[PDB]
Design a protein around this ligand. Structure first.
Ligand code: NAG
Ligand code: NAG
Lengths: 161, 54, 58, 108
């Protein structure tokens, strides 16, 4: 019925040794390249992509919806340019969640003039639990998350009224 | 015991290892003696369905 | 009345995961829908038969 | 290892895979950083690898055991292969199916 949209990992203070600026033509806004508002595309800084490890404790009484993604470059040159490793992984765990992702490199049809893909993932973090994110690259980090408040009688309808 | 506890075996579910036949299975509202070593039980719900005809 | 209301229905429930909510809700819809229908049929059959029974005797 | 189901009954076989909290534990227990577990039958095939990650503790334990199972049909064979991380089946259940039973939740 409602939610609080809040920062889990504020852009400025959470990743001091990664580049948190990164845009794409396919998310262009008012003519400028841009990106998703609740996510951050992390790339290397000064030639490095330091092993990343972050966590968040759900200190709210509410369930928290956390979204993130994994980048799958069109080629090796792009993987080397952005993360500077050919063997990246992303690992996300919580007390009742565990998934490990790896990037895939492939020739792909263009969609929205972009070759390459970002897969999107999510989980609901229960009150009191901890979510841990680890990566060598290819992580589109969560920035904002939603503290959910459930109710009854609502739903999603499709209409042009 | 949870169903997972019973089937995997659980040090505290020892009293169940000798019972081979039954008419129905009774689980309490909030069993505690389940997967004592934490982890994901694959297809757990599906196993519960299989064991409901045994 | 006894012969028509023959129950072969199994109501033993099923567990679902956190990512099987759509299936859980479909299962719930099915059980509630069948319950609403049979409740309707049982009440309607009894009211109609009680009314006809009293007319029969009169 | 392998087992042939020489019973007239279906056999429920359960096993698990261990996922240590770190490299030091993987090296201490299995002595390899590249373990796999492979389980097959005529109509089953799954390959598992361990994952190493920092995890919240559950029941004061960091690290996890995932549990898996399959029903082995009469006359078939189940084969287990591993370099490490296997929580081996010991006991199994030869099942006999019937009708009308189920699982209920009650504190009566
Ligand atoms: C928004 O939708 C319009 C539809 O014409 C499309 O041209 C534009 O590229 C879309 N922009 C984003 C950021 O999705
Ligand atoms: C380097 O990055 C890690 C990422 O998890 C962070 O914890 C650490 O504080 C950063 N450090 C610097 C610039 O010292």
């Amino acid at each position: 019925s409602s939610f609080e949209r809040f920062e889990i990992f504020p852009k400025e203070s959470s990743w001091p040794n990664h580049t948190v600026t990164g845009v794409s033509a396919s998310c262009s806004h008012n003519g400028k390249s841009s990106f998703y508002r609740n996510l951050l595309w992390l790339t290397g800084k000064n030639g490095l992509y330091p092993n990343l490890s972050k966590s968040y404790v759900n200190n709210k009484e509410k369930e928290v919806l956390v979204l993130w993604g994994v980048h799958h470059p069109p080629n090796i040159g792009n993987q080397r340019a952005l993360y500077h490793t050919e063997n990246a992984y992303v690992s996300v765990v919580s007390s009742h969640y565990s998934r490990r992702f790896t990037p895939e490199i492939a020739k792909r049809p263009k969609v929205r003039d972009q070759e390459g893909r970002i897969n999107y993932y999510w989980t609901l973090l229960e009150p009191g639990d901890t979510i841990i994110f680890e990566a060598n690259g290819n992580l589109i980090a969560p920035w904002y998350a939603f503290a959910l408040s459930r109710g009854f009688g609502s739903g999603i309808i499709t209409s042009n009224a | 015991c949870s169903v997972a506890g019973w089937i995997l075996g659980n040090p505290e579910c020892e009293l169940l290892i000798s019972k081979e036949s039954w008419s129905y299975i009774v689980e309490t509202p909030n069993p505690e003696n389940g997967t004592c070593y934490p982890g994901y039980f694959a297809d757990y719900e599906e196993l519960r369905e299989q064991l409901s005809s045994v | 009345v006894i012969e028509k209301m023959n129950t072969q229905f199994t109501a033993v429930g099923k567990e679902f995961n956190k990512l099987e909510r759509r299936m859980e809700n479909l299962n719930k819809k099915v059980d509630d829908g069948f319950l609403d229908i049979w409740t309707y049929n049982a009440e309607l059959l009894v009211l109609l038969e009680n009314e006809r029974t009293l007319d029969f005797h009169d």
